[PDB]
């Protein structure tokens, strides 16, 4: 039906736009829609089943308002107008989260609806194919390398979740590239109240066998055994109460396809022993292969441009693990705002969201705590364990750890003390309380000094000038901190 007119010959059009016309006509035709406006406002906007629920008007606005170099600072520059919008609107523009994606991310995942939501977010795609990396890279247009970052979608990578007497986690076949979901069930059979046990996969037939004591017995040794016969964990000496212990063991399908028990035997110096045990079973389940949590991780990561290596810390450090909600996104958006607003590291932005400096190391990188306090390992290490109550007043002394704190915040003792007061204006004493909370808050007063051209003495002069004098970071909400 194309006319052979002059205007189809001498007018330059972009490619893509011609392709978009073709797809829109094919798409409009199917589903019988009145116009391209329906194709876009209804079909494409609200179609989660596919790579994306694309909202054109949203992107039209987002891109132009981002072409406007201020990055919405011009609206902030005018509070009468900025205040007409929820902060989320502004944040929802700086991050590429369309209203439909927002709703997807904000709905909490209810396990009783794992299938029910699967059918909402996916078309009639059996998980059998959806779960394979061949399909996933296609469904999501991801690099197959990125799929390796999207691993360990559990409450932790280390100490994982437990509820209603079980564990639900993905296990990766390291050479195949595939992942399957397993349910590990744990029922108590003996005196679990004296000593517990947990079993986590880490690869096929590879398990982390963890244990914990509630009541001390003077064992000469501990022997943890499969069906009370095959030793799995050997521990010498009397083990301790409220200490988590672990070892890497092998339990093959012969050991785990049928119900089995792990004995926990506390062998005394005498011929007797005290014991605890739980019954375990490990099975692969299609019933848990929904990975709705993955769908979100992928969509969120691309909307935020936060690779899982930074993003998991952002979401797990601020809320309950294994889910995403509005509260989580708040922290994500805020983290991005500061990252976008100041020439700072994404971790810095997270701290400014009233987040602690984490002691957990991961992904071949030092823990956030170590990055600040042990990179300068001044012939020993600082641990934030409540013991090293180093005297931090002006005219004060201590060991190299005091020097570590001085170095960590790049300030002298007079300023370091003032910084304690900045966090806590009641902490006028000669010490650091030595925990992550106050160290993180010391870091925050310093960060406010790094993001603005302020000295430490000036941080207080300004708070007074403003009316924020005597603000305790030790008692500041994240909303107040952002404020």
């Amino acid at each position: 039906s194309m006319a052979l007119s002059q205007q189809n010959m001498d007018i330059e059009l972009s490619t893509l736009s011609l392709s978009n016309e073709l797809l829109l006509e094919s798409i409009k035709t199917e589903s019988k829609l009145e116009n391209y406006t329906k194709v876009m406002e209804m079909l494409s906007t609200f179609r989660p089943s596919g790579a994306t629920p694309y909202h054109d008007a949203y992107e039209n606005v987002r891109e132009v308002i981002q072409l406007q170099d201020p990055g919405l600072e011009q609206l902030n520059a005018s509070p009468a107008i900025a205040g007409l919008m929820h902060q989320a609107s502004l944040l929802g523009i700086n991050a590429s989260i369309s209203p439909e994606l927002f709703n997807i991310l904000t709905e909490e995942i209810t396990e009783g609806n794992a299938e029910e939501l699967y059918k909402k977010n996916f078309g009639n795609i059996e998980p059998a194919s959806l779960a394979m990396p061949e399909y996933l890279k296609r469904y999501y247009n991801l690099s197959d390398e990125e799929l390796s970052q999207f691993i360990g979608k559990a409450s932790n990578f280390g100490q994982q979740e437990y509820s209603n007497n079980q564990l639900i986690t993905p296990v990766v076949n390291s050479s195949d590239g595939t992942v399957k979901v397993y349910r590990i069930t744990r029922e108590y059979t003996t005196n679990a109240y004296q000593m517990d046990v947990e079993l986590f996969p880490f690869g096929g037939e590879n398990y982390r066998l963890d244990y914990k004591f509630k009541n001390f017995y003077n064992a000469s040794y501990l022997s943890i055994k499969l069906n009370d016969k095959r030793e799995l964990v050997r521990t010498e000496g009397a083990p301790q109460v409220n200490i988590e212990y672990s070892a890497n063991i092998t339990l093959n399908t012969a050991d785990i396809s049928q119900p089995f028990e792990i004995g926990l035997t506390r062998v005394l110096p005498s011929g007797s022993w005290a014991y605890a045990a739980a019954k375990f079973t490990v099975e692969e389940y299609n019933q848990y292969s929904f990975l709705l949590k993955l769908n979100k991780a992928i969509r969120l990561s691309r909307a935020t441009e936060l690779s899982p290596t930074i993003l998991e810390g952002i979401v797990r450090s601020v809320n309950l693990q294994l889910d995403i909600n509005t509260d989580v996104l708040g922290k994500v958006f805020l983290t991005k705002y500061y990252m976008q607003r100041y020439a700072i590291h994404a971790e810095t932005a997270l701290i400014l969201c009233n987040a602690p400096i984490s002691q957990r190391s991961y992904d071949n990188q030092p823990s956030q705590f170590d990055r600040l306090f042990n990179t300068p390992l001044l012939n020993g290490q600082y641990f934030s364990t409540g013991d090293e109550e180093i005297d931090l007043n002006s005219g004060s002394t201590g060991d190299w750890r005091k020097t570590i704190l001085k170095r960590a915040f790049n300030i002298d003792d007079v300023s370091l003390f003032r910084l304690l007061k900045i966090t806590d204006h009641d902490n006028k004493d000669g010490k650091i309380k030595n925990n992550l909370k106050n160290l993180s808050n010391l870091y925050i007063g310093k960060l406010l000094a790094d993001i603005h051209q302020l000295t430490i003495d000036e941080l207080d002069l300004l708070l007074i000038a403003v009316g924020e004098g005597k603000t305790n970071l030790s008692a500041i909400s994240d909303k107040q901190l952002a404020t």
Partner: protein, 71 residues
């Protein structure tokens, strides 16, 4: 089309640091094969090569990545 998808080729990070006398594990008349192969970039380069050639057509570049302004 003929090549099909680029295969996923994971790398191993496991090594036993065996002693040489033990390493000298031989044939006659936890891997069985103590050592591992490399990728074979010659074959992998066919995808890398096509990917660039296609990239250039899609981005209006010449065979060597130079810009061009054809009518």
């Amino acid at each position: 089309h003929l090549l099909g998808d680029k295969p996923y080729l994971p790398l191993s990070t496991t090594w036993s640091d065996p002693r040489l006398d033990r390493a000298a594990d031989i044939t006659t008349q936890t891997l069985t094969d103590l050592f591992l192969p490399q990728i074979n970039e010659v074959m992998m380069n066919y995808w890398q090569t096509l990917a660039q050639r296609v990239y250039n057509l899609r981005h209006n570049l010449s065979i060597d990545g130079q810009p061009l302004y054809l009518p």
